[PDB]
Design a protein around this ligand. Sequence first.
Ligand SMILES: [Ca+2]
Ligand code: NI
Ligand code: NI
Lengths: 96, 97
Amino acid sequence: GMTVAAKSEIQIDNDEVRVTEWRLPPGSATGHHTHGMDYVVVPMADGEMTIVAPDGTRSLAQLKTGRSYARKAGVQHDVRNESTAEIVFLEIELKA
Amino acid sequence: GMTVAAKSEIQIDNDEVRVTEWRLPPGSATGHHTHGMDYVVVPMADGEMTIVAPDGTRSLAQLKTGRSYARKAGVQHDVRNESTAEIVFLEIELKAG
Ligand SMILES: [Ca+2]
Ligand code: NI
Ligand code: NI
């Protein structure tokens, strides 16, 4: 298939967190997925993510290196890189 | 005093987590503190971070951009910048629970 895959590396997966480094080449996509845990995103590169909602509507979100944000369990989205730059962020999922 | 204060900004703080951005200018220190929460360090820049143990001995943590690591509640240290470059990292502390 033509869709380019997002790359992931799990850096930590202990009793507190699962930390995954995500790298999205230009023209890649995570595919739609569902979040089962609250999480923090730490962007490692400046960029522009495309977020596709379950209904197909689309939004762009700016990532700024070192500017973290928090999200709750239940988020459902496809994250795509429609930009010319590799997107890089760490996702820190918050375990119980 | 001649030591420069470390700078901190709390980016996120909620019932599950606290995320603090630490910026240490050359010649700065956090001051000795203890950690009451397990945490994760995310270095935002390569650096050499001085860690002063309770016994006064020092070591130089080798921080690599984007290479996170985990630490346990109970850590007691002063962290300093004796290098020529600003040190920057996020610290992500987990709440109970
Ligand atoms: Ca624990
Ligand atoms: Ni996601
Ligand atoms: Ni500390």
